[PDB]
Design a binder for this molecule. Structure first.
Ligand code: UND
Length: 110
C-alpha cells in the first residue's frame, strides 16, 4: 500500500487543503482519501492510463474556506469524469492530466 499527497499544477487547485492523503492498497485494490475534514472510499476503474472514480465524499460543515470548497468539489468532479495518470520509472510521482494540461501531481508520502 502506497500513499500520496497532491501538489496542484492548475490554478483550480491552488486552494486544495494540504492534508488530503490518497491511499492505494495493492492487495485488495482499495483507494481511499483521508483528511481532517474530508473522507472517501473510491469506486473506480483504471485502464490504459485512464482513471475514473467516485469517492462518496463526507465533508465537515464550515471547516473549509469558500475557495477550498470549490477546489475540492472540482477535484472530485474531475476524478469522476476521468483523468490520465502518467507515472515514471524513477520514483512514485504521478502526473494527473486532463484536457491537454497537467492538473496536478501526486507526490509519495504524507
Ligand atoms: C495505481 C493507482 C494509484 C492512484 C491513486 C490515486 C487516486 C486518483 C485521485 C488522485 C487525486
Amino acid at each position: 500500500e502506497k500513499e500520496w499527497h497532491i501538489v496542484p499544477v492548475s490554478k483550480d487547485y491552488f486552494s486544495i487543503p494540504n492534508d488530503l492523503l490518497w491511499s492505494f492498497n495493492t492487495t485488495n485494490k482499495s483507494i481511499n482519501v483521508y483528511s481532517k475534514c474530508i473522507s472517501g472510499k473510491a469506486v473506480y476503474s483504471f485502464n490504459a492510463g485512464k482513471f475514473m472514480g467516485n469517492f462518496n465524499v463526507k465533508e465537515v460543515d464550515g471547516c473549509f474556506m469558500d475557495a477550498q470548497k470549490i477546489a475540492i468539489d472540482k477535484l472530485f468532479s474531475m476524478l469522476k469524469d476521468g483523468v490520465v495518470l502518467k507515472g515514471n520509472k524513477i520514483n512514485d510521482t504521478i502526473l494527473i492530466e486532463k484536457d491537454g494540461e497537467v492538473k496536478l501531481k501526486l507526490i509519495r508520502g504524507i
